[PDB]
Amino acid sequence: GEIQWMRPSKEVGYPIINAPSKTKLEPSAFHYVFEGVKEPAVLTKNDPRLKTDFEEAIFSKYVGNKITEVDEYMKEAVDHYAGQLMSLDINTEQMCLEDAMYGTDGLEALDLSTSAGYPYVAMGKKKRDILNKQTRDTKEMQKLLDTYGINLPLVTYVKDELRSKTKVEQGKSRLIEASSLNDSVAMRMAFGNLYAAFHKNPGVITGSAVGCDPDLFWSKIPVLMEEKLFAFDYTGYDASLSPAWFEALKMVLEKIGFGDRVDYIDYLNHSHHLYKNKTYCVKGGMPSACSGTSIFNSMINNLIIRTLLLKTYKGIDLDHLKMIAYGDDVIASYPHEVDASLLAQSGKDYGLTMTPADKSATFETVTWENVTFLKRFFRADEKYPFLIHPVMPMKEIHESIRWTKDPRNTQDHVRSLCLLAWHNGEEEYNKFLAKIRSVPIGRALDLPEYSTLYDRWLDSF
Ligand code: NA
């Protein structure tokens, strides 16, 4: 991804967009009960904690475009992945407007909580004023589609979340590029059934994990994997994607029956954004806008890994590459050992910056003991080995419980953390509950005990 130009929105006919400048994150009742070092990400250039230009820092993710066209290794990757998806017999017909709005099997309804994007954000009109879940009315939407059309600018928001001290000082805040409601709706009508098929088929055929339930999915993953695991992290995955990867994605779509609307991918590839009082054009780079976003990033990840394996290991048997991606995150395998360091080297030529799995200093062998997916380790249950626990380290949970975005959601927030934490074992879990109950807010919460969660887990299979 590369920003082509940036200038005052007024100069191109667009209004200034208002964006909050104060985080909703504040110390929780457990701020001093647990250890943590993360704090709210910088949201404005005037933040006292800054140690460098904010604007420059947030847009520095657009490192450029390393490639222009789709080479032969990419075309082969496209053929192999498309052929694989062909086995799913994905319904290729457009999804009706109602279902695209209020959902259907395999696709949840539009989030009435998120931004409606342009021009609604500037007209003060909100999703709640357009959508009606009780009636599933499409009249208001349809009228809005006819009026403002599609391919509208994406509204950029700084993401209000916790970040390390270094990232705060370096102004490395992540961005949200919200597509207009018109585009989200249009995109879901065009690819709704594709999204549904992926959501319903997490695994090594879709090569995707979007819509998965870790508590149940972890027990299924080991079986789908080949003998030798391999993995790596990406630095700024979304923004680093070159236009060629979007073209390769369109080829896949064309081959599986959606050649009909590959034009929608162009909107993601060559896109224009609104940020505050500025507008800019980006060539390449996946906008972080929705579940559609994550599915396409996942499909591209499948194309990337296949491409690097073909370029690095001529004669590789892609039919034995077993991988599952969630956006840029991935867990992969092959019958033979591969060199992640080599793959990373080939990756640079395709515009991808690949580093050792889980922040390792060097590229080390990935095993069932040290591998992580969605920040979770894999651990066989002590009593029933065939049941696999998704284990997220307590460190992350501790960091999260120390802050709140709304005192009214304390119960939900803490329960959600408990569902993640108990997998660390009964001893650790009880210590967690005892600390929570060391303050009045914690004592008033209705939280599940260990045996209750374990029984609930067994009963969910
Ligand atoms: Na883009």
Give 268 Cα–ligand 1 centroid separation in angstroms: 5
Question: What contacts 24+ positions apart, CB below 8 Å, involve 440-444?
Answer: 440/29, 441/28, 441/29, 441/30, 441/410, 442/29, 442/30, 442/33, 442/414
Q: How far is the C-alpha of 396 from the C-alpha of 376, rounded, in Å?
A: 11
Cβ-in-10-Å burial (0-12, 13-18, 19+) of 315 comes to: exposed
Contact 74/248 with Cβ under 8 angstroms?
Answer: yes
Structure tokens at 115: 């931004």
Residues in the chain: 461
Query: Residue 272 Cα, ligand 1 centroid: separation in angstroms?
Result: 8
Resolution in A: 2.1
CA-nearest of 270, 268, 281, 286 to 6 is: 281
Our CA angle for 271, 104, 91, nearest 5°, is: 75
Q: What domains lie within the chain, and their CATH numbers?
A: 1-13+70-202+243-284 (no CATH), 213-242+292-367 (3.30.70.270), 375-461 (1.20.960.20)
**β-pair type (329-334, 354-356):** unpaired
Q: Is-contact 58 163, C-beta < 8 A? A: no
Q: Are 310 and 248 in contact, with CB atoms under 8 Å apart? A: no
Q: How far is the CA of 44 from the centre of ligand 1 (A)?
A: 23
Distance CA 420, CA 376 (A): 9
Q: Is 183 annotated as a binding residue?
A: no
CA of 236 to the centre of ligand 1 (A): 13
Three-state secondary structure of 281-304: EEECCCCCCCHHHHHHHHHHHHHH
Under 8 Å between Cβ of 391 and 374? no
111 marked among binding-site residues? no
